[PDB]
């Protein structure tokens, strides 16, 4: 549901995710690095299923962050694909791909894969 | 076909993979890196479906290579997971995971993922 996803979330590394889910399936917000002052904010955009199933099934969603803002440019982008599971302890469980811009020759090691779990802290 | 996996395969990067498929599912061989060279060779071991479905599906298989030999140790290991399709143009289509041994701090970016297609040409 949109309300359920809207809010502030943190993951196990200490990074901050602030998102707003719109009625049309859109996701907009900011992602912040683990601790590290204020200028560590990056724009994020994504999409979620605004009409999930009844059942105790998660809501699929995903978003992307291009690691460039007015202070830094890491020439990379990460996309998180996962499910939002609501309840008293709501969580967003994801798998992510981080791709860096490389030359033709290092393209073979341009992508890292990992997983993050986010816990909701504010609405 | 079943023991159609046995042979020498090459991927788009120029690495060579030489394997023997045992009747019961084992995969054993050598994986050699760039240039060909002398011991640019590493041991590989894996497993495959020795009784694949009788529908035109490919044969599932997978293998691992730890990047250490008597000359180099890159403190990493790669696993390739995929399927074999035989015929006129036999290929092994894979996706792989390369994990490096890191300290906890770098564990978040310890694994790279990619894909490779091997042919006997």
């Amino acid at each position: 549901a949109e309300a359920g996803i809207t809010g502030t979330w943190y993951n196990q590394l200490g990074s901050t995710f602030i998102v707003t889910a719109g009625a049309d399936g859109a996701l907009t917000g900011t992602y912040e690095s683990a601790v590290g002052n204020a200028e560590s904010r990056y724009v994020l955009t994504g999409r979620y299923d605004s009409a999930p199933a009844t059942d105790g099934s998660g809501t699929a969603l995903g978003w992307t962050v291009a690691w460039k803002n007015n202070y830094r440019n890491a020439h990379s982008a990460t996309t998180w694909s996962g499910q939002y599971v609501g309840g008293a302890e709501a969580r967003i469980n994801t798998q992510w791909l981080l791709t860096s811009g490389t030359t033709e020759a290092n393209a073979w090691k341009s992508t890292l894969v990992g997983h993050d779990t986010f816990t909701k802290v504010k609405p | 076909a079943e023991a159609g996996i046995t042979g020498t395969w090459y991927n788009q990067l120029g690495s060579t993979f030489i394997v023997t498929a045992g009747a019961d599912g084992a995969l054993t061989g050598t994986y050699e890196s760039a240039v060909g060279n002398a011991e640019s060779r590493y041991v590989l071991t894996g497993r495959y479906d020795s009784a694949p479905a009788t529908d035109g599906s490919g044969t599932a298989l997978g293998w691992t290579v730890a990047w250490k030999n008597n000359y180099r140790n890159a403190h990493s290991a790669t696993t390739w997971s995929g399927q074999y399709v035989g015929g006129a143009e036999a290929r092994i289509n894979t996706q792989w995971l390369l994990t490096s041994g890191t300290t906890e701090a770098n564990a978040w970016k310890s694994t790279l993922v990619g894909h490779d297609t091997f042919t006997k040409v």
Binding site: A105, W108 | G14, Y42, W67, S76, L98
Partner: peptide, 8 residues
Amino acid sequence: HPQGPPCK
């Protein structure tokens, strides 16, 4: 890394 292409 030995998994990648040559460093030529």
